[PDB]
């Protein structure tokens, strides 16, 4: 796919756009007309004025409408991401407002040129020219709010990363601070930042690595909270929709010190709730901060949860420490090998 929309031309607010188009007309077209000229020449002057302004408005609007992604016919993962970041119906209606403004300007230009066809004096021709430009200015000024909104959308979507859904992606999730940031910065050269509080990074992060001459990518989630989730804020809905739409080996992280503040019981409950979300995906569970305690010598109370999630198929369990480069590479190797096995079955298909 396009996978990127940084190539959207910058959007100008109503007043700046008005200045740009009207000043371009006043500079790029002749400005001296005389009452003593022929009426036909006067009409040509003012018709050229109206037509040029209409062309400028519609070309700026055409740039706007062609730049922004069609969120309807776009890939479903990108569609859900765009919806979560900026409300889809709001986005669609702002674009539709742009389209209506384009149509209205084009129609007014044609109509006032048609009226100028019968100009009877320089005064009347000037009046018609001013009327046409004033109507266009009124349209643009009514178009104010969509321009500011789409400017913000343009900046943010240009700053969004480039995640291809049809790649070998390794998705990484769990609570904040568990070691997702360290794991990503270890397996890849991704520049995320780690802090001791929740939702430290409010967006998805991407990185890349190679394994057996194949370019794999790795995605790090903002973090998820365990609730009924009937209503949720966009920060974690991004992670939810990524897990849903990314064909990946979900590598869920766990803690035994409860450094994020949540219970291991809450982590197990969240994993049990998300288990039905996992369709034809091989899942691993890595336990971090295990230099203090491990499932091998942990209490049986949590071992009940451990045997329950072992009962849960077909996820697999591992404990790892970020400092051990060999251990983190073995985690990566297991995930990449199971992705390879899935794709080898698909090639048998």
């Amino acid at each position: 796919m396009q996978l990127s929309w940084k190539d959207i031309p910058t959007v100008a607010p109503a007043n700046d756009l008005l200045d740009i188009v009207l000043n371009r007309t006043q500079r790029k077209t002749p400005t001296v007309i005389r009452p003593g000229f022929k009426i036909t020449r006067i009409r040509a002057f003012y018709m050229r004025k109206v037509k040029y302004t209409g062309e400028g408005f519609v070309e700026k609007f055409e740039d706007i409408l062609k730049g922004f992604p069609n969120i309807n016919d776009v890939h479903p993962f990108h569609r859900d991401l765009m919806d979560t970041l900026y409300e889809k119906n709001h986005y669609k209606i702002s674009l539709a407002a742009i389209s209506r403004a384009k149509s209205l300007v084009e129609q007014v230009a044609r109509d006032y040129v048609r009226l100028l066809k019968f100009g009877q004096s320089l005064f009347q021709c000037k009046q018609l020219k001013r009327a046409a430009l004033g109507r266009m200015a009124t349209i643009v000024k009514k178009l104010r709010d969509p321009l500011a909104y789409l400017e913000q959308v343009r900046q943010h979507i240009g700053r969004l990363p480039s995640i291809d859904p049809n790649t070998r992606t390794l998705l990484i999730c769990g609570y904040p601070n568990v070691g997702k940031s360290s794991f990503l910065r270890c397996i890849t050269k991704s520049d995320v930042d780690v802090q001791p509080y929740a939702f430290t990074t409010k967006s998805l992060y991407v990185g890349h690595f190679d394994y057996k001459y194949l370019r794999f990518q790795a995605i790090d989630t903002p973090g998820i909270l365990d609730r009924p989730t009937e209503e949720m804020n966009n920060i974690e809905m991004q992670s939810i929709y990524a897990i849903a739409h990314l064909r990946s080996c979900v590598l869920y992280f766990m803690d035994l010190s409860e450094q994020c503040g949540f219970t291991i019981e809450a982590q197990v409950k969240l994993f049990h709730s998300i288990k039905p979300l996992f369709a034809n995906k091989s899942v691993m569970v890595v336990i971090n901060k295990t230099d203090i305690i491990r499932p091998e010598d942990l209490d049986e109370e949590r071992a009940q949860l451990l045997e329950s999630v072992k009962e849960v198929p077909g996820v697999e369990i591992m404990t790892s420490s970020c400092q051990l480069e060999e251990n983190v590479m073995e985690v990566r190797n297991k995930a990449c090998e199971k992705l390879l096995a899935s794709r080898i079955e698909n090639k048998l298909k």
Binding site: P76, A244, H245, S273, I274, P276, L277, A279
Partner: peptide, 9 residues
């Protein structure tokens, strides 16, 4: 719910 969502994917 979640199953409906992933089905809609």
């Amino acid at each position: 719910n979640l199953e409906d969502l992933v089905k809609a994917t």
